Design a protein around this motif. Structure first.
Motif, short mmCIF file in Angstrom:
data_model
loop_
_atom_site.label_atom_id
_atom_site.label_comp_id
_atom_site.label_asym_id
_atom_site.label_seq_id
_atom_site.Cartn_x
_atom_site.Cartn_y
_atom_site.Cartn_z
N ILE A 189 -8.44 2.42 -1.28
CA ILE A 189 -7.32 1.54 -1.01
C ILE A 189 -6.86 0.94 -2.33
O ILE A 189 -7.57 0.94 -3.34
CB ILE A 189 -7.70 0.42 -0.02
N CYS A 274 0.11 -11.51 5.70
CA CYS A 274 0.73 -10.21 5.48
C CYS A 274 2.11 -10.15 6.12
O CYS A 274 3.03 -9.54 5.56
CB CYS A 274 -0.17 -9.11 6.05
N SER A 280 4.19 -3.64 4.43
CA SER A 280 4.31 -2.52 5.36
C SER A 280 3.02 -2.38 6.17
O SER A 280 1.97 -2.94 5.84
CB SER A 280 4.55 -1.23 4.58
N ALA A 281 3.11 -1.60 7.26
CA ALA A 281 1.94 -1.41 8.11
C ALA A 281 0.79 -0.77 7.35
O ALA A 281 -0.37 -1.14 7.54
CB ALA A 281 2.32 -0.58 9.35
N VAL A 282 1.10 0.19 6.47
CA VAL A 282 0.06 0.81 5.64
C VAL A 282 -0.58 -0.22 4.72
O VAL A 282 -1.81 -0.28 4.57
CB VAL A 282 0.63 2.02 4.86
N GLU A 283 0.24 -1.05 4.07
CA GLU A 283 -0.29 -2.10 3.21
C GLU A 283 -1.18 -3.07 3.98
O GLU A 283 -2.24 -3.48 3.49
CB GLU A 283 0.85 -2.85 2.51
N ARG A 284 -0.76 -3.45 5.19
CA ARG A 284 -1.57 -4.35 6.01
C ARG A 284 -2.90 -3.70 6.37
O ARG A 284 -3.93 -4.38 6.43
CB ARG A 284 -0.79 -4.77 7.26
N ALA A 285 -2.89 -2.39 6.61
CA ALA A 285 -4.14 -1.68 6.88
C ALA A 285 -5.05 -1.71 5.66
O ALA A 285 -6.26 -1.90 5.79
CB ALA A 285 -3.85 -0.25 7.32
N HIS A 286 -4.48 -1.54 4.46
CA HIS A 286 -5.29 -1.63 3.25
C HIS A 286 -5.85 -3.03 3.06
O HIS A 286 -7.00 -3.18 2.65
CB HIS A 286 -4.50 -1.16 2.03
N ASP A 288 -6.54 -5.15 5.50
CA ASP A 288 -7.61 -5.27 6.49
C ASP A 288 -8.89 -4.60 6.00
O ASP A 288 -9.99 -5.15 6.18
CB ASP A 288 -7.17 -4.63 7.81
N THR A 289 -8.77 -3.44 5.37
CA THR A 289 -9.94 -2.75 4.84
C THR A 289 -10.56 -3.53 3.68
O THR A 289 -11.78 -3.58 3.54
CB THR A 289 -9.56 -1.33 4.40
#
Ligand code: BTM
Ligand code: MG
Ligand code: MG
Ligand code: MG
Length: 332
Positions: A189, A274, A280-286, A288-289
């Motif tokens: 990430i 966020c 973005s949704a991808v950034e928010r997933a990163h 979260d990780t």
């Protein structure tokens, strides 16, 4: 006793066994660990389980790098448990050599095992990494190497520092934020800078690193106290407060607990943050990780230190009357 202390923190990487094989070959190939006593002693630390528990998001070659980085930290660390750790000018000069590798000056063929191992870890770390990650982590390595000589100064002084000065030296010699930079890299990430520098994530990052080094201070106190080490939270509290050893351990546990509470309170704000940043949704997933990476470093480091033989074994196999290693692998 450490066996009667738990700290109140909340998986394991599937690559543990594969990484154990790679890392054992790597420490021998690089010359970082030799044969016989050093090898059995190194094996008893279980660096692969530290990598798999502390970085459970890492897979494959990423977990290999985590274990090799840990191997470098621990072998390099112990080289200062001897005359080097009572010689600040010599420590600073040795650490200047390592720092030159960070900022570009490759060691070349036939360099010492610590320089060669570090150069390999650092090259693998930066290969394909975002330039913002490289710049930040380069300065993290600089702080780590430069702090060692200040720990030696404190050993000669023979009194613990105040809390502020303890934190300045101990955060550096503990590796500063390097475990989290490593876990971020190993998870694949990149934290968006807008999230990374939020007050919430900045406080959380500092809290997570404090939690692990303070948990280590409690569990590693026996092997450190006899060597005249001064940058240990329990000793700092005892000296500052004029209290018993038990009172100081209790206060140390409280320093960990309040940081865990702060971390978890702030973690609940991260989805909203966020959204306010419009990530973005991808950034928010990163992001979260990244939260999971920090949580797993705290919980996984502790899980490792309760099962390793490093802290229970050190006072017996490397008593304080001699150096804290079987083989000198770092020329001074
Ligand atoms: C990061 C590895 N370290 C510090 C350089 C090697 C001795 C031990 C340590 C682990 C976790 C917290 C603090 C120290
Ligand atoms: Mg150390
Ligand atoms: Mg140490
Ligand atoms: Mg320690």
């Amino acid at each position: 006793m450490p066996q009667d202390i738990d700290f109140g923190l909340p998986g394991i990487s599937p690559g543990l066994e594969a990484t154990r094989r790679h890392n054992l070959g790597w420490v021998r190939r690089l010359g970082l660990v030799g044969d016989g006593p050093s090898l059995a002693w190194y094996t008893s630390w279980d660096m692969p389980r530290l990598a798999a528990c502390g970085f459970p998001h890492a897979r494959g070659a990423a977990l290999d790098l985590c274990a090799d980085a840990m191997a470098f930290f621990f072998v390099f660390d112990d080289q200062f448990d001897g005359p080097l750790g009572r010689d600040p000018a010599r420590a600073a000069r040795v650490c200047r050599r390592l720092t030159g590798i960070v900022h570009g000056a490759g060691p070349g063929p036939g360099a010492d095992a610590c320089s060669a191992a570090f150069a390999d870890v650092w090259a693998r770390s930066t290969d394909g990494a975002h330039p913002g990650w490289v710049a930040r982590t380069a300065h993290e390595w600089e702080y780590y190497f430069a702090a060692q000589a200040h720990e030696a100064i404190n050993r000669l002084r023979g009194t613990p520092g105040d809390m502020e000065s303890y934190l300045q030296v101990r955060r550096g010699i503990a590796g500063t934020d390097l475990p989290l930079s490593l876990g971020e890299r190993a998870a694949g990430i990149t934290v968006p800078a807008a999230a990374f520098h939020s007050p919430q994530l900045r406080i959380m990052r500092e809290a997570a690193i404090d939690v692990t080094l303070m948990c280590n201070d409690v569990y590693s106190l026996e092997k450190e106290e006899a060597r005249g080490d001064m940058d240990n939270l329990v000793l700092v509290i005892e000296h500052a407060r004029r209290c018993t050893r038990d009172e100081a351990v209790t206060a140390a546990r409280g320093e960990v607990a309040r940081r865990v509470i702060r971390f978890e309170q702030l973690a609940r704000e991260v989805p909203a943050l966020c959204a306010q940043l419009g990530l973005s949704a991808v950034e928010r997933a990163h992001v979260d990780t990244y939260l999971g990476v920090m949580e797993a470093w705290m919980s996984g480091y502790h899980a490792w230190q309760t099962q390793t033989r490093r802290y229970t074994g050190a006072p017996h196999v490397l008593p304080s009357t001699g150096p804290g290693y079987f083989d000198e692998v770092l020329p001074t």
